[PDB]
């Protein structure tokens, strides 16, 4: 088995994209009870990466860099290991669309994914 | 009295873009005690928003939606008041580029500038 398969190559972490022939868990993180593991990723996502259904349904409403560098609690330190930036905040979901509940349930399945995983 | 009819027109839901004729604080939040109202900011940014000197240097290393949604501790409750998205995560800057050193200073301007506002 492998645990650090991501170390075999070098990819842009900002533009990271998992593919149907690459381990999604290696690209981003593995499900677990900690934020550093990955609090989002259903058992269907891990099977195909970007070839997974509904993936673009999340990407459509996604926020641009403006709020990310606007109210997301921008704070970093310049350490010898390199800079470490953090982001904290909240946003209201797209309540005006007829697909609002579908988006809420879709997203919730990935969050509470580890709750139904073996 | 409400009268606000502008909201009937289609404005960017999560693609907030503040222009020279607009107020960055109205698009994000008003710099104050709450974390979510964007306590950080530069008084020269509020002048023009997207027309601010160095504006594209921030977005040049912004995480794509694929990175923004996964290892970011995404959690939201389905409340009557709406669904409230929250997040907590870290990012590594584009420390493999020569402009990184300039970006560090530029980004930090807004992080300390708020404390020097009148």
Short mmCIF file of C-alpha atoms in Angstrom, two decimals:
data_model
loop_
_atom_site.label_atom_id
_atom_site.label_comp_id
_atom_site.label_asym_id
_atom_site.label_seq_id
_atom_site.Cartn_x
_atom_site.Cartn_y
_atom_site.Cartn_z
CA UNK A 1 0.00 0.00 0.00
CA UNK A 2 1.06 3.71 -0.16
CA UNK A 3 0.53 6.58 2.34
CA UNK A 4 2.59 9.46 0.83
CA UNK A 5 2.05 8.69 -2.90
CA UNK A 6 1.65 12.47 -3.48
CA UNK A 7 5.41 12.86 -2.66
CA UNK A 8 6.27 10.92 -5.88
CA UNK A 9 5.51 14.09 -7.96
CA UNK A 10 5.14 17.91 -7.65
CA UNK A 11 1.83 19.67 -8.49
CA UNK A 12 0.34 23.15 -7.92
CA UNK A 13 -1.55 22.87 -4.60
CA UNK A 14 -3.68 25.93 -5.53
CA UNK A 15 -4.79 24.27 -8.83
CA UNK A 16 -4.88 20.73 -7.37
CA UNK A 17 -7.31 18.50 -9.29
CA UNK A 18 -7.76 14.76 -8.61
CA UNK A 19 -8.40 12.52 -11.65
CA UNK A 20 -10.15 9.13 -12.13
CA UNK A 21 -6.69 7.46 -12.30
CA UNK A 22 -5.18 9.31 -9.26
CA UNK A 23 -5.98 8.94 -5.54
CA UNK A 24 -8.27 11.84 -4.53
CA UNK A 25 -7.18 11.17 -0.91
CA UNK A 26 -3.53 11.80 -1.91
CA UNK A 27 -4.33 14.99 -3.88
CA UNK A 28 -6.35 16.67 -1.08
CA UNK A 29 -6.91 14.62 2.11
CA UNK A 30 -8.44 11.41 3.54
CA UNK A 31 -11.72 11.47 5.48
CA UNK A 32 -11.27 11.61 9.27
CA UNK A 33 -12.54 13.34 12.47
CA UNK A 34 -10.06 16.29 12.06
CA UNK A 35 -9.98 19.32 9.72
CA UNK A 36 -6.44 18.39 8.63
CA UNK A 37 -7.73 15.00 7.36
CA UNK A 38 -10.73 16.20 5.26
CA UNK A 39 -14.28 16.96 6.53
CA UNK A 40 -15.73 16.63 2.95
CA UNK A 41 -15.55 13.87 0.29
CA UNK A 42 -18.20 11.15 -0.32
CA UNK A 43 -17.35 7.57 -1.39
CA UNK A 44 -18.35 8.39 -5.04
CA UNK A 45 -15.89 11.34 -5.31
CA UNK A 46 -12.90 9.18 -4.29
CA UNK A 47 -13.82 6.74 -7.13
CA UNK A 48 -13.50 9.22 -10.07
CA UNK A 49 -12.01 12.56 -8.87
CA UNK A 50 -13.19 15.20 -11.40
CA UNK A 51 -15.04 12.56 -13.56
CA UNK A 52 -17.56 12.34 -10.63
CA UNK A 53 -21.18 13.52 -11.19
CA UNK A 54 -22.38 16.79 -9.58
CA UNK A 55 -18.73 18.03 -9.01
CA UNK A 56 -19.39 21.21 -11.18
CA UNK A 57 -22.64 21.84 -9.15
CA UNK A 58 -20.36 22.84 -6.21
CA UNK A 59 -17.89 24.81 -8.40
CA UNK A 60 -20.66 27.08 -9.88
CA UNK A 61 -21.58 28.95 -6.66
CA UNK A 62 -17.93 28.94 -5.39
CA UNK A 63 -16.57 32.32 -4.13
CA UNK A 64 -13.91 34.28 -6.01
CA UNK A 65 -10.57 35.47 -4.53
CA UNK A 66 -12.26 38.77 -3.48
CA UNK A 67 -13.96 37.43 -0.28
CA UNK A 68 -11.01 35.05 0.31
CA UNK A 69 -8.82 38.18 0.60
CA UNK A 70 -11.61 40.43 2.00
CA UNK A 71 -13.30 38.98 5.14
CA UNK A 72 -11.89 35.41 5.45
CA UNK A 73 -9.61 36.43 8.45
CA UNK A 74 -6.38 37.02 6.54
CA UNK A 75 -3.34 36.36 8.78
CA UNK A 76 0.05 34.71 8.11
CA UNK A 77 3.56 34.33 9.57
CA UNK A 78 6.90 34.32 7.68
CA UNK A 79 8.60 31.19 9.03
CA UNK A 80 11.90 29.69 7.75
CA UNK A 81 9.83 26.65 6.55
CA UNK A 82 7.92 29.16 4.31
CA UNK A 83 4.84 31.35 4.89
CA UNK A 84 1.65 29.84 6.41
CA UNK A 85 -1.61 31.72 5.65
CA UNK A 86 -4.91 30.78 7.35
CA UNK A 87 -8.56 31.52 6.43
CA UNK A 88 -11.61 31.62 8.75
CA UNK A 89 -15.14 33.00 8.10
CA UNK A 90 -18.74 32.31 7.04
CA UNK A 91 -21.02 32.80 3.92
CA UNK A 92 -24.84 32.30 3.35
CA UNK A 93 -25.80 29.65 0.74
CA UNK A 94 -27.55 30.63 -2.55
CA UNK A 95 -31.11 30.76 -1.10
CA UNK A 96 -32.69 32.28 -4.28
CA UNK A 97 -32.18 29.27 -6.59
CA UNK A 98 -34.76 26.46 -7.07
CA UNK A 99 -31.82 24.00 -6.71
CA UNK A 100 -30.91 25.38 -3.22
CA UNK A 101 -32.09 22.29 -1.22
CA UNK A 102 -30.55 19.93 -3.83
CA UNK A 103 -27.22 21.76 -3.33
CA UNK A 104 -27.61 21.62 0.52
CA UNK A 105 -28.31 17.83 0.55
CA UNK A 106 -25.57 17.20 -2.07
CA UNK A 107 -22.99 19.10 0.05
CA UNK A 108 -24.20 17.47 3.31
CA UNK A 109 -23.66 13.95 1.86
CA UNK A 110 -19.95 14.74 1.40
CA UNK A 111 -19.59 16.30 4.89
CA UNK A 112 -21.38 13.52 6.80
CA UNK A 113 -19.72 11.02 4.38
CA UNK A 114 -17.47 9.50 7.07
CA UNK A 115 -20.62 9.08 9.25
CA UNK A 116 -21.87 6.36 6.83
CA UNK A 117 -18.44 5.01 5.72
CA UNK A 118 -17.18 1.63 7.08
CA UNK B 1 -38.99 52.31 4.61
CA UNK B 2 -37.22 49.79 2.32
CA UNK B 3 -37.41 51.13 -1.32
CA UNK B 4 -34.25 49.11 -2.23
CA UNK B 5 -35.11 47.90 -5.76
CA UNK B 6 -31.49 47.53 -7.00
CA UNK B 7 -31.44 44.01 -5.51
CA UNK B 8 -34.08 42.93 -8.07
CA UNK B 9 -31.29 43.16 -10.72
CA UNK B 10 -28.77 40.29 -11.02
CA UNK B 11 -25.63 41.09 -9.00
CA UNK B 12 -22.80 38.58 -8.42
CA UNK B 13 -23.92 36.23 -5.62
CA UNK B 14 -20.41 34.98 -4.58
CA UNK B 15 -18.30 36.74 -7.34
CA UNK B 16 -18.18 40.06 -5.38
CA UNK B 17 -16.31 42.70 -7.46
CA UNK B 18 -15.97 46.23 -5.96
CA UNK B 19 -15.41 49.00 -8.60
CA UNK B 20 -14.19 52.67 -8.38
CA UNK B 21 -17.82 53.93 -8.19
CA UNK B 22 -18.56 51.43 -5.33
CA UNK B 23 -17.40 50.90 -1.71
CA UNK B 24 -15.29 47.79 -0.97
CA UNK B 25 -16.81 47.73 2.57
CA UNK B 26 -20.34 47.43 1.12
CA UNK B 27 -19.25 44.44 -1.06
CA UNK B 28 -17.34 42.63 1.74
CA UNK B 29 -18.31 44.01 5.19
CA UNK B 30 -17.57 47.10 7.35
CA UNK B 31 -14.17 46.88 9.12
CA UNK B 32 -15.02 46.63 12.85
CA UNK B 33 -15.10 44.14 15.80
CA UNK B 34 -16.64 41.16 13.91
CA UNK B 35 -14.25 38.81 12.06
CA UNK B 36 -16.81 38.26 9.22
CA UNK B 37 -17.13 42.02 8.49
CA UNK B 38 -13.52 42.14 7.14
CA UNK B 39 -11.57 43.77 9.98
CA UNK B 40 -8.44 43.90 7.74
CA UNK B 41 -8.06 46.34 4.78
CA UNK B 42 -5.96 49.22 3.33
CA UNK B 43 -7.49 52.72 3.07
CA UNK B 44 -6.03 52.95 -0.49
CA UNK B 45 -7.96 49.78 -1.51
CA UNK B 46 -11.36 51.19 -0.43
CA UNK B 47 -10.59 54.02 -2.95
CA UNK B 48 -11.05 51.88 -6.12
CA UNK B 49 -11.37 48.13 -5.22
CA UNK B 50 -10.56 46.17 -8.44
CA UNK B 51 -8.58 49.22 -9.80
CA UNK B 52 -6.20 49.26 -6.72
CA UNK B 53 -2.43 49.31 -7.52
CA UNK B 54 -1.19 45.66 -7.41
CA UNK B 55 -4.78 44.16 -7.35
CA UNK B 56 -4.00 41.16 -9.72
CA UNK B 57 -0.99 40.10 -7.53
CA UNK B 58 -3.40 38.81 -4.85
CA UNK B 59 -5.59 36.68 -7.13
CA UNK B 60 -2.49 35.21 -8.93
CA UNK B 61 -2.04 32.55 -6.17
CA UNK B 62 -5.71 32.19 -5.03
CA UNK B 63 -6.80 28.52 -4.45
CA UNK B 64 -9.19 27.25 -7.14
CA UNK B 65 -12.66 25.94 -6.03
CA UNK B 66 -11.18 22.41 -6.24
CA UNK B 67 -8.73 23.36 -3.42
CA UNK B 68 -11.12 25.76 -1.57
CA UNK B 69 -13.69 22.94 -1.08
CA UNK B 70 -12.19 19.78 0.52
CA UNK B 71 -9.52 20.23 3.27
CA UNK B 72 -11.15 23.57 4.39
CA UNK B 73 -13.34 22.20 7.32
CA UNK B 74 -16.63 22.85 5.52
CA UNK B 75 -19.65 22.62 7.84
CA UNK B 76 -23.13 24.21 7.54
CA UNK B 77 -26.42 23.65 9.43
CA UNK B 78 -29.82 23.74 7.68
CA UNK B 79 -31.54 26.43 9.79
CA UNK B 80 -34.83 28.33 9.14
CA UNK B 81 -32.75 31.55 8.79
CA UNK B 82 -30.82 29.87 5.92
CA UNK B 83 -27.82 27.53 5.55
CA UNK B 84 -24.63 29.07 7.07
CA UNK B 85 -21.33 27.88 5.53
CA UNK B 86 -18.21 28.05 7.79
CA UNK B 87 -14.53 27.15 7.08
CA UNK B 88 -11.10 26.74 8.77
CA UNK B 89 -7.87 25.92 6.85
CA UNK B 90 -4.28 26.90 5.91
CA UNK B 91 -2.55 27.78 2.56
CA UNK B 92 1.08 28.01 1.34
CA UNK B 93 1.85 31.18 -0.70
CA UNK B 94 3.44 31.10 -4.22
CA UNK B 95 6.89 31.01 -2.55
CA UNK B 96 8.43 29.43 -5.73
CA UNK B 97 8.20 32.80 -7.63
CA UNK B 98 10.49 35.89 -7.35
CA UNK B 99 7.47 38.21 -6.80
CA UNK B 100 6.57 36.22 -3.62
CA UNK B 101 8.70 38.55 -1.44
CA UNK B 102 6.85 41.60 -2.82
CA UNK B 103 3.46 39.87 -2.43
CA UNK B 104 4.28 39.13 1.26
CA UNK B 105 4.72 42.88 1.95
CA UNK B 106 1.73 43.89 -0.24
CA UNK B 107 -0.67 41.40 1.41
CA UNK B 108 0.52 42.33 4.94
CA UNK B 109 -0.23 46.04 4.20
CA UNK B 110 -3.99 45.43 4.66
CA UNK B 111 -3.41 43.20 7.72
CA UNK B 112 -1.70 46.00 9.73
CA UNK B 113 -3.21 49.03 7.90
CA UNK B 114 -6.57 48.55 9.68
CA UNK B 115 -4.87 49.28 13.06
CA UNK B 116 -3.49 52.58 11.70
CA UNK B 117 -6.86 53.75 10.23
CA UNK B 118 -8.14 56.98 11.92
#
